[PDB]
Amino acid sequence: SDIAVFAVGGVTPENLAQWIDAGCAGAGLGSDLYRAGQSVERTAQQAAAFVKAYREAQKQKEQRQDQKSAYALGASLGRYMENSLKEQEKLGIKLDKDQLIAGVQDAFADKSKLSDQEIEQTLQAFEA
Amino acid sequence: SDIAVFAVGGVTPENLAQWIDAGCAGAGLGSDLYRAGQSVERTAQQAAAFVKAYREAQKQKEQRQDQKSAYALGASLGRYMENSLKEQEKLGIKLDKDQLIAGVQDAFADKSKLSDQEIEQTLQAFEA
């Protein structure tokens, strides 16, 4: 797991993202960065491009990871609810499913049709 | 006459006017102003609405009263003239009615075709 793998050979600022996505810790850049006899200005240009591509690409990867981390959270709560419903069903209680989702959405969006106090007294009444 | 009557029950900032018009000295406001568990901000909003509705509505009522007070004044003067004409008719004088109204309108609008001096010497001549 801890061995760092570097792609070397035909890596470009455009494709760098795909190497990093595939599991490369980084890359060695040859002809696409420096070819013998190019200007210092070309070296500064290509090096800027690769740093940008890495950091932009790395940033994108981090954002994707964050998104994925956010994303499951929902699933675990959705399953939690699904299983609670099945528990309720065995006690003869069958909850309207669309409303349950509508509550989640509305509250998350700061537009719950119930006040926090209402929500709390309703759940207490539901217990009863 | 001096008993103050307060409407309580289903009074809104929208209908408050009609209660005040009907003879209510004021109103008690319950659920439409405060329901248990609403925010302090909602209380300030509804209370602002009712004060506005009262003062706007009260203002409208006062304006209507002023209008009514202005309005009769005319009637009493119109009757005064009508009766003076009938008096003149018995002396064999029949005044052009449209002109009489035209004088009232023009002068009131600051566009009398006669100067104040003219008006006064004409009335003196009419006496004769």
mmCIF file of N, CA, C and O in Angstrom, chain A residues 114-115 117-118, chain B residues 35-38:
data_model
loop_
_atom_site.group_PDB
_atom_site.id
_atom_site.type_symbol
_atom_site.label_atom_id
_atom_site.label_comp_id
_atom_site.label_asym_id
_atom_site.label_seq_id
_atom_site.Cartn_x
_atom_site.Cartn_y
_atom_site.Cartn_z
ATOM 1 N N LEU A 114 -42.963 22.379 9.593
ATOM 2 C CA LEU A 114 -43.113 22.283 11.028
ATOM 3 C C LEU A 114 -41.976 23.009 11.753
ATOM 4 O O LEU A 114 -40.819 22.938 11.330
ATOM 5 N N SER A 115 -42.308 23.694 12.849
ATOM 6 C CA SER A 115 -41.303 24.285 13.749
ATOM 7 C C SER A 115 -40.573 23.200 14.502
ATOM 8 O O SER A 115 -41.082 22.099 14.617
ATOM 9 N N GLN A 117 -40.216 22.937 17.562
ATOM 10 C CA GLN A 117 -41.004 22.486 18.689
ATOM 11 C C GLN A 117 -42.053 21.481 18.215
ATOM 12 O O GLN A 117 -42.289 20.464 18.874
ATOM 13 N N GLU A 118 -42.650 21.759 17.063
ATOM 14 C CA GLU A 118 -43.693 20.896 16.545
ATOM 15 C C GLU A 118 -43.133 19.514 16.274
ATOM 16 O O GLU A 118 -43.726 18.486 16.620
ATOM 17 N N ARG B 35 -48.807 32.120 17.506
ATOM 18 C CA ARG B 35 -49.093 30.721 17.771
ATOM 19 C C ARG B 35 -47.904 30.129 18.546
ATOM 20 O O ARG B 35 -46.736 30.439 18.250
ATOM 21 N N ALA B 36 -48.204 29.276 19.526
ATOM 22 C CA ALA B 36 -47.180 28.705 20.408
ATOM 23 C C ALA B 36 -46.058 28.051 19.611
ATOM 24 O O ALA B 36 -46.296 27.111 18.849
ATOM 25 N N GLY B 37 -44.843 28.566 19.779
ATOM 26 C CA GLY B 37 -43.663 27.988 19.136
ATOM 27 C C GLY B 37 -43.165 28.688 17.882
ATOM 28 O O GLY B 37 -42.201 28.228 17.263
ATOM 29 N N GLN B 38 -43.813 29.786 17.493
ATOM 30 C CA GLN B 38 -43.306 30.625 16.405
ATOM 31 C C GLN B 38 -42.121 31.476 16.886
ATOM 32 O O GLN B 38 -41.949 31.697 18.086
#
